């Protein structure tokens, strides 16, 4: 090869640690444990590299700055991640060439070290203490590193949530430019990846067979954002917020496919029965009591798709204006019989609310959601429900279409709980709980935004399968917007986590792309916004 | 299509056979390899009844035997050319993703109602949200069904003859036809569907839903949300304004269902907007909008089955204004429309993508054309009822002259 | 060779993919099928590289920026492209050396990868997954790549739009200049091409012979713009726009030489006959109903070369000013007799319009173009058409010169349709419908511009031959302007579609050079302006 | 001036199909049979396309008969062209062999191709070889692949020197052999309909007779020429689709 | 072959009459008279059996019930019947395998006899 060009298969292996495991003896261990004597990877994959990451390296990053890591897993090669779906086991080292795109005028060194399993690359504070290699910024040939397979077992389960080795990159000596420019001179560290040598697969399962502890969390987020919808109302996802705590329990599902609420993950309009019809008053509007005849899918008594963004005492108290609760979620109400005979004449605008059943006294808001407390109230101040279509032996289906404030208080992070219910969801440290911004219609010229715990396809994917997110770690995704690229971690609680200050807003266009990285532990610091 | 199976060079297999019998399926090909794109014919292995199955035990019941087929890659089989995994190739994606693995809560492309089953119809005209294998539509709507956002052009007050209504048109902001708003129904009220009656003072048959007025900044008029029928009217009338034959961008309208009410003065002004859903269907006759599609002006799209294969439609489920079941016949379902819309699908113009359909009782075959339309054997008028446990299985590409095992 | 100079034949072949076809065995297969035992290519061409493209590579282009592809075809060597007019088939590989105009101070890499046939190079989302080679910007010796011929068949048809291999170039690590300045430091990637080895031609056709599915799309656009005219009026083409939708049907021809309008592709002046003469009124000027005696060459009744940019209700309402329609394209009218006794005295300034016969009542405007609606008014206030000169048994012909507005609305993307005529033309994704900014003579001191669907030499070229644009593809043209450089794709509908923001204006001087890249599919993303 | 390797294209077919042996009787390879006769008038100017003979089994009546049993073919035919006209007439006809992928009715320079002048005064016929230049290893019997052709054009117009105002017609005949390396590939049952349809030979009868149109069913008189038409009754596509009700 | 499956070309020739003509000597006589020295039949047809008839055989048919005759003609192979539109003469023997769709519980025999020319089988 000429000195400016670099073909495939070309590797200059630098041994960054004189404690490599016996590769072929681990290959013997796999062949004893599974009978995997023959190789399962085509040599077209074993010979050529494939691009995995590229990392920025500025003047303005000091020594010891973590550039990025490459964790050992079959998903860091696209061909190996494709081939892994037919197999129940894997094991073996990878090979990884690093190219640094810096001129011969720069200066600066990168520490590249292989990390033992069970030690987090982002949490290492002293990177030159580990046995490490240096890579100069002036380097021309790409430098290859073996990422060894240090494993307790004879093979890794494809299920297996065990720690593997990583390859970390840190700034050893900062990047400088002799040309005194006030602007930032940027260098690019690209990482490519082979299956190296002793890598093989173990145990034929049929392709796409769901294994024991879940599916891969790659399908939690879309490939690009598009017209994604959140799990509270189904409004359009606008961006992200960083909040301290949150209480969202409707349509929130764990990695164990368990919810704590009463609704199903694809959002539908609320079908419900009419229990007691109420006429309008000089004080308060005409309203209607709601309850299924023990036909709720999760809580029999709570109808499917009742909003937790309804009107309550926790959200906003009633005002002597519109003669109704101030803040809540509204939509039109369609009455229909048991055979589906829709009352087609009127379709009154309607607010979701929880009321105190014990009142009578003018009936006021309740703190929480009780199956005997569910109600819908007219928005029109002096109208009345119709006599035959909204009778006590009828049904109603209501959508969640817009939001009304009648104050300066929205229902952004606010969730109406149930009785005897205290679900709190908190971020620990150097990682913040993140929520999606739904987009409602509003009763004013301002933007109506609710903060939802996850989006609809994340809720359906958690709902329908078990997702292999173990309780110690997160499924981490890269997020590329037009300007900001950052990381999001999804827990096994179903909640989101990313770095930054509580209150940080991100705006996500529908060209926002997500990329599944892998499982990083909860103690890892995610590169957040700003 | 082979009518004489013992004329081909063939093997016999007895019904009394104990060992399984292996056959090589050869690769007779013109080319040096098959493209993974490639829609070229390969060899097949057919099975025909040579001598009929008999039981010496004289039972009136049917004695059934099972012929199971297993498959290796045999010998000289190999793959050729590394593309990256999941790379879309030249003439499309595989049509495996046209239908779901199990039915579930699937929705059709006309209103978005629940898919109940299949019908066999002679012809159909459905052009909204229908996309080809070439990812081309002929209509004006986008494949995920959304509520119709539209402008208010002219507000009309109620009359002793006819209800209060409202004229519709986007300011050249339609995604496909600028002038036709996204998600206007082709199941609207028209002269082709049902003429007006001097009962409800409105068109008889159509699709209705509530109407939400809102401003340009999104300021929703939250007070009233009147029930509303989608209709196309003749703009030239005035004379009491009556139904039109087709859909013209100056003909679009929505009319109150309530017989003597009136649109509000400020929320439904001429500088406002409205968003309406398609929630239920009204008849006011014995004529539904099952296979009926309101066309456009100068538009004649006909979709016909040829022979020994019948055009098939999905049965949507609407809410109804009565105690009967409201069913519209839609050309495809929503995820089929989105999958045709977003990718090119490798269905060549001579063939079909064939699927096995397992319900509780009936298992049959469905062929999807490159037109996006469905095809299966049987008599015109055959109804199938599909529970949400109905499973689909992609078989492959069979030509249009193939006879699909239909229902019954 | 001295280390700074490179002669011909000098190549350092870098292998990017270790799976080349058996070159001399495919050459034997071509000779069995066609009898091409000996070489049909002169050996002066096989020994020397000749230039094909030159790609600009900047600081301001990120990683994964597609620089360009070299698709395998005879038109990528200038000698082989000339020879391919004689031959009906070909087969074999080309050899491609790449030279980068980078100093020794710069840094940056490009990915060179050979792409399998059937895969669009401009649809590859991760460029480095395939087996690739890295070429550095600081390289001195040029690097040679073999572009293999992976093919099902024994040879390629010179017609056949069957896919061949490509050599795509992407930016891997961006180009950086350490001498930091806001100015863009441009690098030049120049690609040269040999016929490599097993390349040959197959079957003699006569030179310049149109083959079965059309001529090449090279002659659609000129080599350089010049004084080019559009097909709406025939005015000077100023530049481009990017419009969402358009309706231009007149003189527009498909790749199958099929038109949907009523005119012929070189714009002649509008030969027309006079049906009913009309005098001037105090409210509106004099006018003249137009209709031939069923002598339109496409729609007999619509006259040859009647404008679509006439005055209509969609264009502009009539004002109580000059007693005529506000916005239209005007011209001087010439009245002549059937044998050639042209009327010499008067020549009225005459605006094109469309009116209503059913009115009777002052006759007003009309929405569309009906063969009874064809009518033109004066520009003067109280003049009148002469008795013998402009009678009911005479003719009239008008040369379109003006463009009047009389409001703030123009006829830019506006086309007047026919009755029973709703044609739309729309792009779908990563690509925007482009149009040609025409030029007329404004009635003001502003610039009077129409947007036309295609130009005359594109309309004439689609007429006289069929053009090899298959229905799933585009014909892509490089646009070498003074400042900008981008791509324009022409469809089989005859419409221009390119990348960029809807509404982007481009100024095209007559030194704008158009250069033909090959055929790309409709789903391909085009590098548009800015 | 390039012919394919005849017996080595035959090795490609025996690999791709298993057709190692011959399937055409050798009495057909020795007998020219009249395929088609073209009328050639005074009233056709220079450059008039007379008709092309595309390479297929249907251009020999013995080979079109044999091809009902076979799903594939490949190989060259041998053709000769003869004129039946008086020795007084003046006019040439170019007959040129056309490479595959070129439309014969789009060729504007027939005398540049490998050609032959077939004058009206000719006595012996002009023999041609029509090669099988193909990308593939065989041809599908139903497949509409590009083949080599044999076009005919009026190079010089046919004129009658005597004072005769009537139209004088000349007759161009084409005879055909299967040449040499021609063979068949894949047994289908005899008369088996292949995938994309039957041949269009059976659209019109061998002679008109008492034929009936599809609007009412009256006796067919002859043709007309109309610009546009709307007939939808009893009109069926090649895809066997009608839009009417009868 | 496995004992339940039968491919093409599989034949167990049972002789019903031990007075066959000299087959290859009659083939030489045909080539003197007509010049048919080489084979006019493709060898794909000579190797495989193709179906001609199917005869129902019941409990309710007594002994001596005529099931059917296979008279020697080109129209008793479907490929040879198609080829015989090209030819004005023929000669030679055909080979006929017979398969009976009987279970192992049934019983019954058929007579197969080759009949001299000039004698009606019925």
Author numbering:
A (entry chain C), C (entry chain B): 21 to 380, 385 to 554
B (entry chain C): 143 to 380, 385 to 554
D (entry chain A): 38 to 283
E (entry chain B): 21 to 142
What does the paper say about this structure?
Here, we determined the capsid structure of a HuSaV virus-like particle (HuSaV-VLP) at 2.9 Å resolution by single particle cryo-electron microscopy (cryo-EM), and successfully built an atomic model of the capsid. The cryo-EM map clearly shows a T=3 icosahedral symmetry with 90 protrusions, composed of 180 copies of the VP1 protein in total, distributed along the icosahedral 2-fold axes (C/C dimers) and quasi 2-fold axes (A/B dimers) on the surface ([Fig fig1] and S2A). The cryo-EM map allowed atomic modeling of residues 38–554 for subunit A, residues 21–554 for subunit B, and residues 21–554 for subunit C, except for one disordered loop (residues 380–384) for all subunits ([Fig fig2]). The icosahedrally independent A/B and C/C dimers show slightly different conformations, mainly between S-domains in each dimer, which are the bent and flat conformations, respectively, as in other T=3 viruses. In addition, N-terminal regions of residues 21–37 in the B- and C-subunits extend underneath the capsid shell and interact with the neighboring subunits around icosahedral 3-fold axes ([Fig fig3]), although the N-terminal region is disordered in the A-subunit, and no N-terminal network is observed around icosahedral 5-fold axes. Therefore, the N-terminal network around the icosahedral 3-fold axes likely stabilized the hexameric units in the capsid. The P domain is further divided into two subdomains, P1 (233–281 and residues 444–554) and P2 (residues 282–443) subdomains. Unexpectedly, in addition to the residues in the P2 subdomain, the residues in the P1 subdomain are involved in the interaction between the P domains ([Fig fig6]). The βB’-α4 loop (residues 465–469) in the P1 subdomain and the βC”-βD” loop in the P2 subdomain are mainly involved in the interaction between the P domains. In particular, residues 294–306 in βA”-βB”, 337–347 in βB”-βC”, 375–388 in βD”-βE” (including a disordered region, 380–384), and 403–417 in βE”-βF” show significant sequence variabilities between the HuSaVs, which are designated as hypervariable region 1 (HVR1), HVR2, HVR3, and HVR4, respectively ([Fig fig4]).
